[PDB]
Coordinates of C-alpha atoms and ligand atoms in Angstrom, one line a residue:
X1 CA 46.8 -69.9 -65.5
X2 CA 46.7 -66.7 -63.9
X3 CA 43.2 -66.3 -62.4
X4 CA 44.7 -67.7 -58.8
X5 CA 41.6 -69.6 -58.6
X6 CA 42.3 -71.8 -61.6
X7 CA 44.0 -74.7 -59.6
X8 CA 40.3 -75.1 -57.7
X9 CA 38.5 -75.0 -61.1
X10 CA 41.3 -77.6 -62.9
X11 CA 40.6 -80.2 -60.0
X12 CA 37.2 -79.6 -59.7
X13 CA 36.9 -80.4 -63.3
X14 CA 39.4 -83.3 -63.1
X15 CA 37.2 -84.4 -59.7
X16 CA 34.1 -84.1 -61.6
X17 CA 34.6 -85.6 -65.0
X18 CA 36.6 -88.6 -63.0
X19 CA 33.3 -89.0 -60.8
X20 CA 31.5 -89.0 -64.0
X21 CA 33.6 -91.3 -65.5
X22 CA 33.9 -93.7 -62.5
X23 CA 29.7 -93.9 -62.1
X24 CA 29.6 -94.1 -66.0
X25 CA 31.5 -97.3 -65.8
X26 CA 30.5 -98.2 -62.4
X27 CA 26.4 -97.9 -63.9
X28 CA 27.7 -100.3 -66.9
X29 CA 25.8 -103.4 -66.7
X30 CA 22.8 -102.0 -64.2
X31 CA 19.6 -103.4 -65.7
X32 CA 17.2 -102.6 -62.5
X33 CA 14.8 -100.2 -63.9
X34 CA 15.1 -98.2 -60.5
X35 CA 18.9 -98.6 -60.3
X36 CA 19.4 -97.0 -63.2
X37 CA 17.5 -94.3 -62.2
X38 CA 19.7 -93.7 -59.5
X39 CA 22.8 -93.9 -61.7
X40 CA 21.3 -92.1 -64.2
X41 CA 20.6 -88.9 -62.1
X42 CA 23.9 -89.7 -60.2
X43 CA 26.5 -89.8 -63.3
X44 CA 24.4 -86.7 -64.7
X45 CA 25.2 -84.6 -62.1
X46 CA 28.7 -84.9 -61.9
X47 CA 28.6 -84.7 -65.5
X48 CA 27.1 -81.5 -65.7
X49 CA 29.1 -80.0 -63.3
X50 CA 32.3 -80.9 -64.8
X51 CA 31.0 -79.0 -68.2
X52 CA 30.4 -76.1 -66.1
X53 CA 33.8 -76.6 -64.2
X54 CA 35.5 -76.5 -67.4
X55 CA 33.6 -73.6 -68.4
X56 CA 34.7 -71.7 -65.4
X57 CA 38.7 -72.8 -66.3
X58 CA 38.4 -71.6 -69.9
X59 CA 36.6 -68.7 -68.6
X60 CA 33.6 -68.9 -70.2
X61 CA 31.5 -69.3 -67.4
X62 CA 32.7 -66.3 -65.8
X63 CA 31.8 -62.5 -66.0
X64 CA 32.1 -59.0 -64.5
X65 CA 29.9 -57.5 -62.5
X66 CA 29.9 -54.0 -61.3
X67 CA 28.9 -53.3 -57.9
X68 CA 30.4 -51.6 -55.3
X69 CA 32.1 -49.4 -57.9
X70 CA 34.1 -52.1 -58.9
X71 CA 34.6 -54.8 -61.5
X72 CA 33.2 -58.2 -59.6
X73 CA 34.4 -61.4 -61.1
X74 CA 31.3 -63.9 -61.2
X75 CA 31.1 -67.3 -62.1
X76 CA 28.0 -67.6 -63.1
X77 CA 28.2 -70.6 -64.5
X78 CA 28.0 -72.2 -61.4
X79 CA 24.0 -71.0 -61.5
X80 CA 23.6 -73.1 -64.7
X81 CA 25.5 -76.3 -62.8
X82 CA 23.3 -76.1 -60.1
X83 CA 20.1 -75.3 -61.8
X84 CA 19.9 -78.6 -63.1
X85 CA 21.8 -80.5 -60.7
X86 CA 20.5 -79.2 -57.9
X87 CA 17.0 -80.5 -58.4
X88 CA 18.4 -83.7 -59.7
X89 CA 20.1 -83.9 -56.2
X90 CA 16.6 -83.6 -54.7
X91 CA 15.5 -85.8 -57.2
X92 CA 17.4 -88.9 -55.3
X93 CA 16.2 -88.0 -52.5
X94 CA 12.5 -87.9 -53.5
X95 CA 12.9 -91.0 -55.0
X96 CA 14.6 -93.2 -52.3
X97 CA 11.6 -92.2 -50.1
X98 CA 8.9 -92.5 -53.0
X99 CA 8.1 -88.9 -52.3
X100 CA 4.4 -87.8 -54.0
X101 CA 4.6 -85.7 -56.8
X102 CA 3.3 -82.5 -54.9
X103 CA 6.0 -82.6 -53.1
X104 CA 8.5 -83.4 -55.7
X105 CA 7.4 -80.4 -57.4
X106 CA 7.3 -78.4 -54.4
X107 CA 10.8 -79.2 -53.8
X108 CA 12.2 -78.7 -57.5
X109 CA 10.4 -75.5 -57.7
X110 CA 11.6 -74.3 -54.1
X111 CA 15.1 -75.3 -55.8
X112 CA 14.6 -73.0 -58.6
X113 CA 13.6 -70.5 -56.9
X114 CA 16.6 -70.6 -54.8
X115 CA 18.8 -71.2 -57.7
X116 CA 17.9 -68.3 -59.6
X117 CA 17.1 -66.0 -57.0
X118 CA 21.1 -67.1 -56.2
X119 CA 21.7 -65.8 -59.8
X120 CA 19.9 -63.2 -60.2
X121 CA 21.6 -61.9 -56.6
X122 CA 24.7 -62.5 -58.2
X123 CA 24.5 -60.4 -61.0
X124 CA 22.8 -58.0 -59.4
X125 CA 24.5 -54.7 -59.4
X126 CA 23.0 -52.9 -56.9
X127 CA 24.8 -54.1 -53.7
X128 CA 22.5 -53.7 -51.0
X129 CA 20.2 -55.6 -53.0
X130 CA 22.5 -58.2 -53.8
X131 CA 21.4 -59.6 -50.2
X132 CA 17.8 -59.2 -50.3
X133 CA 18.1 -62.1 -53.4
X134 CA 20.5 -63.8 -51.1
X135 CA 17.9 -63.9 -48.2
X136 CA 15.4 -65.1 -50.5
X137 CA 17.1 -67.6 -52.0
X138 CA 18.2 -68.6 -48.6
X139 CA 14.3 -69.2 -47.6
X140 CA 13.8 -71.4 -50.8
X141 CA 16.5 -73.2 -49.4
X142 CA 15.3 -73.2 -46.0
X143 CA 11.9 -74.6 -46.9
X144 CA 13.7 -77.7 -48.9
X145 CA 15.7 -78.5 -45.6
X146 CA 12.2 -78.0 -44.0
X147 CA 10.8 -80.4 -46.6
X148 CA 13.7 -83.0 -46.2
X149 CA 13.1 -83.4 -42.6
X150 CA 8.9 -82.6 -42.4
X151 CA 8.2 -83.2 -45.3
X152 CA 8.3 -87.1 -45.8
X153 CA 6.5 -97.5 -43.4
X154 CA 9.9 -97.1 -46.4
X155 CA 12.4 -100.1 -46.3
X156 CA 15.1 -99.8 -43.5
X157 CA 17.6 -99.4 -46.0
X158 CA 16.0 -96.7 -47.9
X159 CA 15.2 -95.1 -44.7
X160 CA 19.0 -95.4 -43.5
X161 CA 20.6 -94.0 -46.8
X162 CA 18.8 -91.2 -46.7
X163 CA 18.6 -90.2 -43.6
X164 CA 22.5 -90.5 -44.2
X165 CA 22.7 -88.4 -47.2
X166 CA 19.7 -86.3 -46.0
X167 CA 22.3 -85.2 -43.4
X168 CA 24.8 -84.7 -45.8
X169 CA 22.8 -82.4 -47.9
X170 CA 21.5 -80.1 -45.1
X171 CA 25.2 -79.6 -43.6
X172 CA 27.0 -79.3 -47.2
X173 CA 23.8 -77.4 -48.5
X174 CA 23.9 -74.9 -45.7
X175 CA 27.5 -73.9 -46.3
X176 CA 26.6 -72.6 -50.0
X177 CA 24.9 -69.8 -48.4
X178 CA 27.3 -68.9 -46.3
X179 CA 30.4 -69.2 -48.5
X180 CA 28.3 -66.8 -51.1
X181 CA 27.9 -64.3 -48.4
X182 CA 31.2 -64.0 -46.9
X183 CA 32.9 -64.6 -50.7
X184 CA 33.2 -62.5 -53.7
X185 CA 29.3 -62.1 -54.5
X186 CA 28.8 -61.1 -51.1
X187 CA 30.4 -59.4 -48.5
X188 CA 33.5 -60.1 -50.1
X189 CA 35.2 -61.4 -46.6
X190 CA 36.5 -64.0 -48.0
X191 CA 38.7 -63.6 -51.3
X192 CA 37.8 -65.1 -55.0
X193 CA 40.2 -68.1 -54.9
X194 CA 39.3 -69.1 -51.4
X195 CA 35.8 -69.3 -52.2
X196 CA 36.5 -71.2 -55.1
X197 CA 37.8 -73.7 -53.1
X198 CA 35.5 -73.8 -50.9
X199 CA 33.0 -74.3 -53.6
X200 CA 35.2 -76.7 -55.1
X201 CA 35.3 -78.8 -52.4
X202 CA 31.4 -78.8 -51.4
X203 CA 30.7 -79.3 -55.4
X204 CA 32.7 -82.3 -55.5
X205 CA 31.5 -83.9 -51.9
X206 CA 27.9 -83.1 -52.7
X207 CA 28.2 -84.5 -56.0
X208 CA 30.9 -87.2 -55.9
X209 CA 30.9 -88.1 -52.4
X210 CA 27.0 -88.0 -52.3
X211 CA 27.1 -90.6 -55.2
X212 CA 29.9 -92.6 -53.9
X213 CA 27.2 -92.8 -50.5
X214 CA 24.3 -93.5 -52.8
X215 CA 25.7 -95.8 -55.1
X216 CA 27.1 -97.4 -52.6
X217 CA 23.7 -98.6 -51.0
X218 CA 21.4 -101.4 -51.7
X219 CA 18.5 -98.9 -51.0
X220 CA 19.0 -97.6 -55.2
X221 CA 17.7 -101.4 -56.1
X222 CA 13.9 -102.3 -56.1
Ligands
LI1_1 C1 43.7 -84.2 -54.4 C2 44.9 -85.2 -54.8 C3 46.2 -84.4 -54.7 C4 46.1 -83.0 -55.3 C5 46.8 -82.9 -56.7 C6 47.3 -81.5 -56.9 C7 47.7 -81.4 -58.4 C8 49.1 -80.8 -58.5 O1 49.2 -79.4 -58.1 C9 50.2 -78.7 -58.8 C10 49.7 -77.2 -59.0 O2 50.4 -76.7 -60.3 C11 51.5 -78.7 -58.0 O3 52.3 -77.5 -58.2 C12 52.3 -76.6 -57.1 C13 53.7 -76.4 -56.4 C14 53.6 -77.0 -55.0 C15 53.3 -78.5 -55.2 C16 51.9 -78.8 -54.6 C17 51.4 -80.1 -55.0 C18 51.1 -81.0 -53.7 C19 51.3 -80.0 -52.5 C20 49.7 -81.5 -53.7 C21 49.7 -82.9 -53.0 C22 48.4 -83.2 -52.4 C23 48.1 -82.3 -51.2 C24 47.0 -82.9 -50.3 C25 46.2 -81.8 -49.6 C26 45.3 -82.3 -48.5 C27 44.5 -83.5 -48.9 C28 44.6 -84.6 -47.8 C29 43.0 -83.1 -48.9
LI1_2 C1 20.7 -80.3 -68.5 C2 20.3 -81.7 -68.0 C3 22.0 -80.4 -69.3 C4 22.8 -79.2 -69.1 C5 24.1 -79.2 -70.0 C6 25.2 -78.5 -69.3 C7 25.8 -77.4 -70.2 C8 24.8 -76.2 -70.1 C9 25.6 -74.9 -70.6 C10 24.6 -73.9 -71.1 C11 25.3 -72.5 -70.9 C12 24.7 -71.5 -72.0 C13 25.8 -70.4 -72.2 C14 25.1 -69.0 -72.4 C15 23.7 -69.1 -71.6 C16 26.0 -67.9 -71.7 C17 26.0 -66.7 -72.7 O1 27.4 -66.3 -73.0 C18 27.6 -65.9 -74.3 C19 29.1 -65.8 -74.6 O2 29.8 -65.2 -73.4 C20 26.9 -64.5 -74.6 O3 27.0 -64.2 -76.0 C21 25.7 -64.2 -76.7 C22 24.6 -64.9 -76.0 C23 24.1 -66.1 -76.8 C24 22.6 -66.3 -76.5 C25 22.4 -67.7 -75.9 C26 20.9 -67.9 -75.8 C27 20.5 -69.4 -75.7 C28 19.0 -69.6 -76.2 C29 18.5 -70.9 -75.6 C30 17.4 -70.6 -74.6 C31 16.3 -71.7 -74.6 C32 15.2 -71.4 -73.6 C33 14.7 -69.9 -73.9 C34 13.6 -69.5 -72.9 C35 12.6 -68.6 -73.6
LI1_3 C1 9.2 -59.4 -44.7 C2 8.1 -59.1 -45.7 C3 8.6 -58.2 -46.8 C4 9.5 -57.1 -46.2 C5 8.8 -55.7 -46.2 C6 9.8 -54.6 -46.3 C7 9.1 -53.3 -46.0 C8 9.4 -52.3 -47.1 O1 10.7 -51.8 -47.1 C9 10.9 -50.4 -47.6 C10 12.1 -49.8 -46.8 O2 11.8 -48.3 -46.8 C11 11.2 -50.5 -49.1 O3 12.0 -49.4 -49.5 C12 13.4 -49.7 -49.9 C13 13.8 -49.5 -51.3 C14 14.0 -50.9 -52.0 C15 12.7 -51.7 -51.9 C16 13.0 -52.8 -50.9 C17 11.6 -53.5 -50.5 C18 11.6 -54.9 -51.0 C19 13.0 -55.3 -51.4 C20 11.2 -55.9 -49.8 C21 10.5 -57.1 -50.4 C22 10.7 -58.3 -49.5 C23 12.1 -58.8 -49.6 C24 12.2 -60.3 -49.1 C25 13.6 -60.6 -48.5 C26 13.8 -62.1 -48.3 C27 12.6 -62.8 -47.6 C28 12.3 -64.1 -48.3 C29 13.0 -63.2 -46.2
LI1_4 C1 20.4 -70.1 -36.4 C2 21.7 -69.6 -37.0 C3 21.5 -68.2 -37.4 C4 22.1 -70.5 -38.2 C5 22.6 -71.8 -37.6 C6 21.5 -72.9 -37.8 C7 22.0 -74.3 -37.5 C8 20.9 -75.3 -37.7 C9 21.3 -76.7 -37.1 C10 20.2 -77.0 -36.1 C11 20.0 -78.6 -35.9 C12 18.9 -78.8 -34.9 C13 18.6 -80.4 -34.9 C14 17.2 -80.6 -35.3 C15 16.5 -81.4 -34.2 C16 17.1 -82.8 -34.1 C17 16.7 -83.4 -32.8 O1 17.2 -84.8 -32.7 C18 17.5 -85.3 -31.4 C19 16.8 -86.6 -31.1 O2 15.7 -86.4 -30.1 C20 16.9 -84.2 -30.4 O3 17.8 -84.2 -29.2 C21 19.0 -83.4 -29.4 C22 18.8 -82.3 -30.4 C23 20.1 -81.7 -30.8 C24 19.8 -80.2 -31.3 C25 20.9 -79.3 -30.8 C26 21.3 -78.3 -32.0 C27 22.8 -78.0 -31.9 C28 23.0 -76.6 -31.5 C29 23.1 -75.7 -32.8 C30 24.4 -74.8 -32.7 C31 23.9 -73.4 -32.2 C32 24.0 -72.4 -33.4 C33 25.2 -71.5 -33.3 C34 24.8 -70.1 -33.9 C35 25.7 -69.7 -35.0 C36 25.3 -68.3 -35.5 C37 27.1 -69.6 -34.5
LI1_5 C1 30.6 -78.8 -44.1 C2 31.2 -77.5 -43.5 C3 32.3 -77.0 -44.5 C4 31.8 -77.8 -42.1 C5 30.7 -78.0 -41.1 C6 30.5 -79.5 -40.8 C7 29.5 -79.7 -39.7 C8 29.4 -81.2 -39.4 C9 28.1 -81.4 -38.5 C10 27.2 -82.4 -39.2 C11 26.4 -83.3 -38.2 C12 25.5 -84.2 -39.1 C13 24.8 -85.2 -38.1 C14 25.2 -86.6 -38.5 C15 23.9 -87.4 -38.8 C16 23.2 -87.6 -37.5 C17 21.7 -88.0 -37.8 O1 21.0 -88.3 -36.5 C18 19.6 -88.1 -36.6 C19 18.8 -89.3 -36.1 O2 18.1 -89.9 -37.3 C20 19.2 -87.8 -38.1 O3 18.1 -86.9 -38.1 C21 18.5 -85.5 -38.0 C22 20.0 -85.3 -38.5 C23 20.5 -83.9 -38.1 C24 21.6 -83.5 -39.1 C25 21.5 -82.0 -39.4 C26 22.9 -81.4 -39.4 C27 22.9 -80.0 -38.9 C28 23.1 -79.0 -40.0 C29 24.6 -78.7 -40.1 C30 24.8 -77.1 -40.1 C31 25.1 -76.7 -41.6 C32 26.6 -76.4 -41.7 C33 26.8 -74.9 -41.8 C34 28.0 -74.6 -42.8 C35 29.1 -73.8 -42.2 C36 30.2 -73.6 -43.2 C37 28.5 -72.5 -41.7
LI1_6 C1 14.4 -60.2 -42.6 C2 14.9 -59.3 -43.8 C3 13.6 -59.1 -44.7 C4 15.8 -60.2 -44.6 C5 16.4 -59.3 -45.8 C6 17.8 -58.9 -45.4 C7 18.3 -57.9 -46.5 C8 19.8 -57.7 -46.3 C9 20.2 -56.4 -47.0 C10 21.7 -56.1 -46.9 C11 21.8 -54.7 -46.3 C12 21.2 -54.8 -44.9 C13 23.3 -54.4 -46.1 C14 23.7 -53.2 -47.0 C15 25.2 -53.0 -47.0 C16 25.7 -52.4 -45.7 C17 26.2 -53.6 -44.8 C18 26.7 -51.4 -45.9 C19 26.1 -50.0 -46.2 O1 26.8 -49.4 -47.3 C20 28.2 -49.8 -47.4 C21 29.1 -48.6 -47.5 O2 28.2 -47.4 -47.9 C22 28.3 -50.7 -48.7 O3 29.7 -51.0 -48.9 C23 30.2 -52.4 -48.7 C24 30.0 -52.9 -47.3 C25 30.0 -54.4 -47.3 C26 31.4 -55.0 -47.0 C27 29.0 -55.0 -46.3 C28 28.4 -56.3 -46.6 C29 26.9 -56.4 -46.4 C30 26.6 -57.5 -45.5 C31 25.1 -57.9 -45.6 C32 24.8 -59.1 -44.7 C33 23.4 -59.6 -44.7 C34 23.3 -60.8 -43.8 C35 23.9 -60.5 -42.5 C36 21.8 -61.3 -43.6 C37 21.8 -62.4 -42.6 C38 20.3 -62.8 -42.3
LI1_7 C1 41.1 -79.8 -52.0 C2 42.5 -79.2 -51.8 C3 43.5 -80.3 -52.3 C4 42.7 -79.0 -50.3 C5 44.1 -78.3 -50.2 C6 43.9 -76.8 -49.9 C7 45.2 -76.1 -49.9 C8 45.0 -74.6 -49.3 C9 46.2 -73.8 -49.8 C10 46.1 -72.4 -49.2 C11 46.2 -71.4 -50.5 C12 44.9 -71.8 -51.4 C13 46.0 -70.0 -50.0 C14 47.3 -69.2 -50.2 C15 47.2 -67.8 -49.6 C16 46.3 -66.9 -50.4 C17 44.9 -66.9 -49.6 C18 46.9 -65.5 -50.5 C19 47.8 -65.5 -51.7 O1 49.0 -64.7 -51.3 C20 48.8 -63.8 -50.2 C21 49.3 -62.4 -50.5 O2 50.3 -62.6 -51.7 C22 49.5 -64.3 -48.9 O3 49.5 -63.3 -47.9 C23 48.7 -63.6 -46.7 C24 47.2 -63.8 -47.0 C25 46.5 -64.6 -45.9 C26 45.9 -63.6 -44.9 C27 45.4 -65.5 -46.5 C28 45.2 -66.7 -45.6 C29 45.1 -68.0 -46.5 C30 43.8 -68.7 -46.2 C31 43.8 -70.2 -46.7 C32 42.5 -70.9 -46.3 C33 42.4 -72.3 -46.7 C34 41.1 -72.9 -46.2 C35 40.0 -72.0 -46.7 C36 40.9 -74.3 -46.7 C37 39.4 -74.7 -46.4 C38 39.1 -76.1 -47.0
SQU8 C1 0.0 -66.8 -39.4 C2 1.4 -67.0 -38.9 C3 2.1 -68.4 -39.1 C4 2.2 -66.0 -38.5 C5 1.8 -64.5 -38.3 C6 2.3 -63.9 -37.0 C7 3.3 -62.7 -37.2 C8 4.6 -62.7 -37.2 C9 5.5 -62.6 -38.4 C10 5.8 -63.9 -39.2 C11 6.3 -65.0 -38.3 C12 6.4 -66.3 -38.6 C13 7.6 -67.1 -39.0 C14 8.6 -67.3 -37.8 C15 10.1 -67.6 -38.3 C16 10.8 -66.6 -38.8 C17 12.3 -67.0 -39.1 C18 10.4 -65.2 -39.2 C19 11.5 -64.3 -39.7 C20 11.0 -62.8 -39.8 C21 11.6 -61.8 -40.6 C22 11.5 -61.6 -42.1 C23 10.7 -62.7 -42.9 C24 9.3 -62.4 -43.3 C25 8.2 -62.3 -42.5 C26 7.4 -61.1 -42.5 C27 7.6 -63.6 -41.9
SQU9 C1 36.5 -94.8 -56.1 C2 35.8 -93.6 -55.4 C3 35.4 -93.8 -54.0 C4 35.9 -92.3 -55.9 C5 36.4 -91.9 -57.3 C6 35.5 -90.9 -58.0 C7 36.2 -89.6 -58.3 C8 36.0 -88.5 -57.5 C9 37.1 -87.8 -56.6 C10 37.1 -88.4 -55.2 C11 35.8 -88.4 -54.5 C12 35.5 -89.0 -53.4 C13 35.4 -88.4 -52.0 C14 34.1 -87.5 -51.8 C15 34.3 -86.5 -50.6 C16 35.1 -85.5 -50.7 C17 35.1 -84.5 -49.5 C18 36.1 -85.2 -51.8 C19 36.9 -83.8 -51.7 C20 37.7 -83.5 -53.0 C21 38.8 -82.7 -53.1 C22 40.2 -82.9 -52.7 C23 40.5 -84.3 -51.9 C24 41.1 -85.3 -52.7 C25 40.6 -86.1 -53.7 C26 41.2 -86.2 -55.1 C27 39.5 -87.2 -53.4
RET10 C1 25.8 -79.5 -57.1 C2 26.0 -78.5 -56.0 C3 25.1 -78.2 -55.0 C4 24.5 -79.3 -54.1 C5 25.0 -76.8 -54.7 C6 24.0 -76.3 -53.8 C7 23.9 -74.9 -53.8 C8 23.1 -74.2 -52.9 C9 22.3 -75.0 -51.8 C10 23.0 -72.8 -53.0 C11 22.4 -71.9 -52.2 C12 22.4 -70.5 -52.2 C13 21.6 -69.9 -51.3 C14 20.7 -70.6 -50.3 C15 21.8 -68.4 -50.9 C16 22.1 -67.6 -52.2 C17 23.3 -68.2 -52.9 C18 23.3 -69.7 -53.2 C19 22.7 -69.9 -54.6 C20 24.8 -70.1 -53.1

């Protein structure tokens, strides 16, 4: 189409829903209790996002927002994508380590916060302020690093997968923020369709390629 960033969106929605599809059928047959609630959590997520990737194509998920005097396209559906599969994220990693509920909820709620803090910074039309919601979202997201690595005897194969995609999520995690600050609902550094990219191409490794690694493991299986 002619939004430059439509390429990212069309194979970010073809990556997801084949991801989705792949641990769909991939989940067929699973009858472990725990397993499945690792495939569960882990087709969801993909599947989600592809929704919201196809919302951003059609150009639903997207919208104007006025700051710096001028007329800002935000996706902001990506907030709704990641409001729910962010936690879910955090979700397989709570569970591989058997994290207590406390700090389950800590870690959702941090995630909230973060996500909608996120949101409400990107629709925020006051531009200054724009970065006060991006700081703060950025400490929610700080503390659930904080939490991933301080905040947990677990079998050697749990403890291998996820330090493995522990690692993946604080390196892919971290670039979000950045990305958002340099991009479009930032500093604006960075143009739309390169962001979009970008996004495009954490999205699908932290959802795909973080499957792919947890699926992948014997650590999902009681
Ligand atoms: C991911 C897999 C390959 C990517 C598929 C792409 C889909 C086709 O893109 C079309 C855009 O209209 C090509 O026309 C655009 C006109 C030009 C043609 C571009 C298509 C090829 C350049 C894409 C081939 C894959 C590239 C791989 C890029 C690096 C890869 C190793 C990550
Ligand atoms: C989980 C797991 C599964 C997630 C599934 C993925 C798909 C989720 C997509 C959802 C996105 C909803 C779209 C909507 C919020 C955006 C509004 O855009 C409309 C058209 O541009 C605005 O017109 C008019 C606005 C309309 C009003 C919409 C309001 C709705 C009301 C439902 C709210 C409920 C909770 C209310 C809290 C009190
Ligand atoms: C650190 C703690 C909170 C920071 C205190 C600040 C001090 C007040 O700032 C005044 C500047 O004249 C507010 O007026 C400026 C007009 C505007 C009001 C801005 C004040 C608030 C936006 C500051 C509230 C704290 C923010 C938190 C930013 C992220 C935090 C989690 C790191
Ligand atoms: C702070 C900036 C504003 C934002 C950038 C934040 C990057 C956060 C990554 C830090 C990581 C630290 C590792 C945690 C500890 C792990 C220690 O494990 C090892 C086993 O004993 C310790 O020995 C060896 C330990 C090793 C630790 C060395 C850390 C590396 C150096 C980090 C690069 C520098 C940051 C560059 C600044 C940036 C603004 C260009
Ligand atoms: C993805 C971007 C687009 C490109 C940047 C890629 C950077 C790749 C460096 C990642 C490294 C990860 C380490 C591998 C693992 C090693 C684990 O060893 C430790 C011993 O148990 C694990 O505990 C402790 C493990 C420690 C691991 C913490 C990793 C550090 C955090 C990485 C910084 C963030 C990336 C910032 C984004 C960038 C765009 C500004
Ligand atoms: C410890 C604290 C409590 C943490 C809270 C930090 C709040 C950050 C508030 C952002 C504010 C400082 C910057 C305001 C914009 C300023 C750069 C430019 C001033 O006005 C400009 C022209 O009149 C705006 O046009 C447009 C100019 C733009 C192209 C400039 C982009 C702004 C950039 C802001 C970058 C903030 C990060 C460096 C924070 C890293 C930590
Ligand atoms: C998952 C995928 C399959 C991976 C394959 C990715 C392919 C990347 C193709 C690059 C393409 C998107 C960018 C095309 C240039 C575009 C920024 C500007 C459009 O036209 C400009 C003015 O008409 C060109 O002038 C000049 C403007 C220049 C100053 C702009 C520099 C371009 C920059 C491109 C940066 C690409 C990296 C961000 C990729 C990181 C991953
Ligand atoms: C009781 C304790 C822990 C601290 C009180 C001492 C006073 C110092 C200020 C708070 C420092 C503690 C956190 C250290 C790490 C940081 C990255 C602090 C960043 C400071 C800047 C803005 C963030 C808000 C703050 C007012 C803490
Ligand atoms: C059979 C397997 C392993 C995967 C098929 C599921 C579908 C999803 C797409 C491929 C995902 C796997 C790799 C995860 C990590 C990444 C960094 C992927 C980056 C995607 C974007 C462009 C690169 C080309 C791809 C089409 C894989
Ligand atoms: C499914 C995709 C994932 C794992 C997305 C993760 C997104 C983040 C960690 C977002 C973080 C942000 C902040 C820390 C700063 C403000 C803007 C955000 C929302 C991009």
């Amino acid at each position: 189409t002619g939004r430059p960033e439509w390429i990212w969106l069309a194979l970010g929605t073809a990556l997801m829903g084949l991801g989705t599809l792949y641990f769909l059928v991939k989940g067929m047959g699973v009858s472990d209790p725990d397993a499945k609630k690792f495939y569960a959590i882990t087709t969801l997520v993909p599947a989600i996002a592809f929704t919201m990737y196809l919302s951003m194509l059609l150009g639903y998920g997207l919208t104007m927002v006025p700051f710096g005097g001028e007329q800002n396209p935000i996706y902001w559906a990506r907030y709704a994508d990641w409001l729910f599969t962010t936690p879910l994220l955090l979700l397989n990693l709570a569970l591989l380590v058997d994290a207590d509920q406390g700090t389950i909820l800590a870690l959702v709620g941090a995630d909230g916060i973060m996500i909608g803090t996120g949101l409400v910074g990107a629709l925020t039309k006051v531009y200054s302020y724009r970065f006060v919601w991006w700081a703060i979202s950025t400490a929610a997201m700080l503390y659930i690093l904080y939490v991933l690595f301080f905040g947990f005897s677990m079998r050697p194969e749990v403890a291998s997968t996820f330090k493995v995609l522990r690692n993946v999520t604080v390196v892919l995690w971290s670039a979000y923020p950045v990305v958002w600050l340099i991009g479009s609902e930032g500093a604006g550094i960075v143009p739309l369709n390169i962001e979009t990219l970008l996004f495009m191409v954490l999205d699908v490794s932290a959802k795909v390629g973080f499957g792919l690694i947890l699926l992948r493991s014997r650590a999902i299986f009681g």
